[PDB]
Amino acid sequence: DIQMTQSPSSMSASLGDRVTITCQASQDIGNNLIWFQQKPGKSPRRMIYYATKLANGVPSRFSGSRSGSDYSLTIISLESEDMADYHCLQYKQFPLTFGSGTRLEIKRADAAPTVSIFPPSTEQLATGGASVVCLMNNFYPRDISVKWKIDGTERRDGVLDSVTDQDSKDSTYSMSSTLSLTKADYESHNLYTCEVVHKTSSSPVVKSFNRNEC
Amino acid sequence: MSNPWKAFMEKYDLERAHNSGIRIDLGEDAEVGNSKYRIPAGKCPVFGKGIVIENSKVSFLTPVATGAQRLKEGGFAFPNADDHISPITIANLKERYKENADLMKLNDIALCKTHAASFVIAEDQNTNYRHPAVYDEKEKTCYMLYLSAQENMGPRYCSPDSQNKDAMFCFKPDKNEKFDNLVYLSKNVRNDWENKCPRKNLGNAKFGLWVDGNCEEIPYVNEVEARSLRECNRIVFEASASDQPRQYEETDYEKIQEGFRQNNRDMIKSAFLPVGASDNFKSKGRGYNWANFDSVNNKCYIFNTKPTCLINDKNFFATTALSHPQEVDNEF
Amino acid sequence: EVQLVESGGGLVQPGRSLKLSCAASGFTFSNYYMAWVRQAPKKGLEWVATITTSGSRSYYPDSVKGRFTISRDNSESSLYLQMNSLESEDTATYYCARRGYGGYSEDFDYWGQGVMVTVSSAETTAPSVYPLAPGTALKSNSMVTLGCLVKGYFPEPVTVTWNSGALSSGVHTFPAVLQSGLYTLTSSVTVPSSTWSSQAVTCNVAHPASSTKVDKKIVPREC
Q: What would the 3-class secondary structure string for A68-110 be?
A: CCEEEEEECCCCCCCCCEEECEECCCCCCEECCCEEEEECCCC
B95 sits in which H/E element: helix B90-96
Identical fold for domains A1-108 and A109-211, yes or no, is: yes
Which pairs with CB-CB distance under 8 Å and at least 24 residues apart come from C23-30? Answer: C23/C77, C23/C78, C24/C77, C24/C78, C24/C79, C24/C96, C24/C98, C25/C77, C26/C1, C26/C2, C27/C2, C27/C98, C28/B262, C28/B263, C28/B264, C29/C72, C29/C74, C29/C77, C29/C78, C30/B264, C30/B266, C30/C54, C30/C74
Cα distances (Å, whole numbers) of residue A143 to A23, A41, B100, C171, C188? 27, 23, 44, 21, 20
Residue of B nearest to A69 (CA): B99
> Per residue, what are the HEC states of B222-285?
EEEECCCHHHHHHHHHHHCCECCCCCCCCCCHHHHHHHHHCCCHHHHHHCCCCCCCCHHHCCCC
**C198 three-state secondary structure:** helix
Q: What is the identity of the amino acid at B310? A: L
CA A130 to chain centre: 28
**B319 three-state secondary structure:** strand
B311 sits in which H/E element: strand B309-311
Residues of B in contact with A64 (CB under 8 A): none
In this complex, do B34 and C56 lie within 8 Å of one another by their Cβ atoms? yes
Q: State the method.
A: X-ray
Domain locations in chain A?
Answer: 1-108, 109-211
Cα distances (Å, whole numbers) of residue B248 to A121, B289, C50? 87, 21, 36
CA A70 – CA B268 distance, rounded (Å): 38
Label the pairing between strands A159-160 and B49-54.
unpaired
Residues A7-39, buried b or exposed e (16+ Cβ, 10 A)?
A: eeeebebeeeeebbbbbbbeeebbbbbbbbbbe
CA B184 – CA B174 distance, rounded (Å): 11
Distance from CA of C69 to the nearest CA of B (A): 16
Longest Cα pair distance anywhere in chain A, in angstroms? 70
With an 8 Å Cβ cutoff, is B162 touching chain C? no
Is B45 within 8 Å of B193 (Cβ atoms)?
yes
Label the pairing between strands A53-54 and A45-49.
antiparallel
Is A192 within 8 Å of A178 (Cβ atoms)?
no
Distance from CA of C14 to the nearest CA of B (A): 29
Q: Which domains are delineated in chain C? A: 1-121 (2.60.40.10), 122-219 (2.60.40.10)
Is B81 within 8 Å of B65 (Cβ atoms)?
no
CA B254 – CA A107 distance, rounded (Å): 62
C11 sits in which H/E element: strand C10-12
Breaks (C-N over 2.5 A) in chain B follow: 250, 277
Residue spans of alpha helices (H) in B146-220:
193-196
CA C18 – CA C81 distance, rounded (Å): 8
Domain locations in chain B?
Answer: 1-18+192-239+286-332, 19-191+240-285
CA nearest neighbour of B202 among B283, B39, B322: B322
Residues of B in contact with C101 (CB under 8 A): 121, 265
First to last CA, chain B: 22
Q: How many CA atoms lie within 13 A of B111 on its CB side?
A: 25
In this complex, do C175 and A162 lie within 8 Å of one another by their Cβ atoms? yes
In this complex, do B123 and A94 lie within 8 Å of one another by their Cβ atoms? yes
CA C83 – CA C62 distance, rounded (Å): 14
CA B60 – CA B269 distance, rounded (Å): 15
Q: What is the identity of the amino acid at C69? A: T
Distance from CA of B23 to the nearest CA of A (A): 34
CA B207 – CA B233 distance, rounded (Å): 14
Query: Which residue, among C2, C105, C132, would best test binding to A if mutated, counting the most A CBs under 10 Å from its CB?
Result: C132
Cα distances (Å, whole numbers) of residue C210 to A124, B256, B297, C87? 21, 55, 97, 22
With an 8 Å Cβ cutoff, is B264 touching chain C? yes
With an 8 Å Cβ cutoff, is B193 touching chain C? no
CA A1 – CA B48 distance, rounded (Å): 44
Residues of C in contact with B127 (CB under 8 A): 57
Residues A167-199, buried b or exposed e (16+ Cβ, 10 A)?
A: beeebbbbbbbbbbbeeeebeeeeebbbbbbbe
Distance from CA of B99 to the nearest CA of A (A): 7
CATH topology of domain B1-18+192-239+286-332: Hepatocyte Growth Factor (3.50.4)
Longest Cα pair distance anywhere in chain B, in angstroms? 66
**B115 three-state secondary structure:** helix
Which superfamily does CATH assign the domain made up of A109-211 to?
Answer: Immunoglobulins (2.60.40.10)
Beta bridge partners of B38: B29
With an 8 Å Cβ cutoff, is B31 touching chain C? yes
DSSP B23-52: SB---EEEE-SSSEEEE---SS-EETEEEE
Residues of B in contact with C104 (CB under 8 A): 81
Is A82 within 8 Å of A104 (Cβ atoms)?
yes
DSSP B112: H
Is B280 within 8 Å of B29 (Cβ atoms)?
no
Contacts of C197 (CB under 8 A, 6+ apart): none
Distance from CA of B284 to the nearest CA of A (A): 31
Distance from CA of A174 to the nearest CA of C (A): 8
CA nearest neighbour of B187 among B51, B312, B28, B321: B28
CA A196 to chain centre: 18
Which superfamily does CATH assign the domain made up of A1-108 to?
Answer: Immunoglobulins (2.60.40.10)
Q: Where are the beta strands (DSSP E) in chain A?
A: 10-13, 19-24, 35-38, 45-49, 53-54, 62-67, 70-75, 85-87, 89-90, 97-98, 102-106, 116-118, 129-139, 144-150, 159-160, 173-182, 191-198, 205-210
CA C189 – CA C169 distance, rounded (Å): 7
Beta bridge partners of B328: B201
Residues of B with CB under 8 A from a CB of A: 96-97, 99-100, 118, 121-123, 125
Residues of B in contact with A96 (CB under 8 A): 122-123
Is A121 within 8 Å of C136 (Cβ atoms)?
no
Left, alpha or beta for C114 (phi > 0: left; psi -120 to 50: alpha)? left
The phi and psi torsions of A95 (rounded to 5 degrees) equal -85, 155
CA nearest neighbour of B170 among B188, B186, B151: B151
Cα distances (Å, whole numbers) of residue C20 to B91, C8, C15, C43? 47, 5, 17, 21
Q: What is the identity of the amino acid at C89? A: E
Q: What is the identity of the amino acid at C118? A: T
CA B134 – CA B126 distance, rounded (Å): 23
Is C91 within 8 Å of C119 (Cβ atoms)?
yes
CA A13 – CA C129 distance, rounded (Å): 39
Is B306 within 8 Å of B12 (Cβ atoms)?
yes
Kindly report the number of other CB atoms within 10 A of residue B160's CB atom: 4
CA B275 – CA B140 distance, rounded (Å): 34
With an 8 Å Cβ cutoff, is B67 touching chain C? no
Is B38 within 8 Å of B276 (Cβ atoms)?
yes
Burial class (CB in 10 A: 0-12, 13-18, 19+), C98: buried
Contacts of B124 (CB under 8 A, 6+ apart): C33, C50, C52, C57, C59
CA B99 – CA A25 distance, rounded (Å): 15
DSSP B59: -
Residues of A in contact with C98 (CB under 8 A): none
Beta bridge partners of C72: C79
Resolution, angstroms, 1 dp: 3.1
Left, alpha or beta for A105 (phi > 0: left; psi -120 to 50: alpha)? beta
Contacts of B161 (CB under 8 A, 6+ apart): none
Label the pairing between strands C92-98 and C78-83.
unpaired
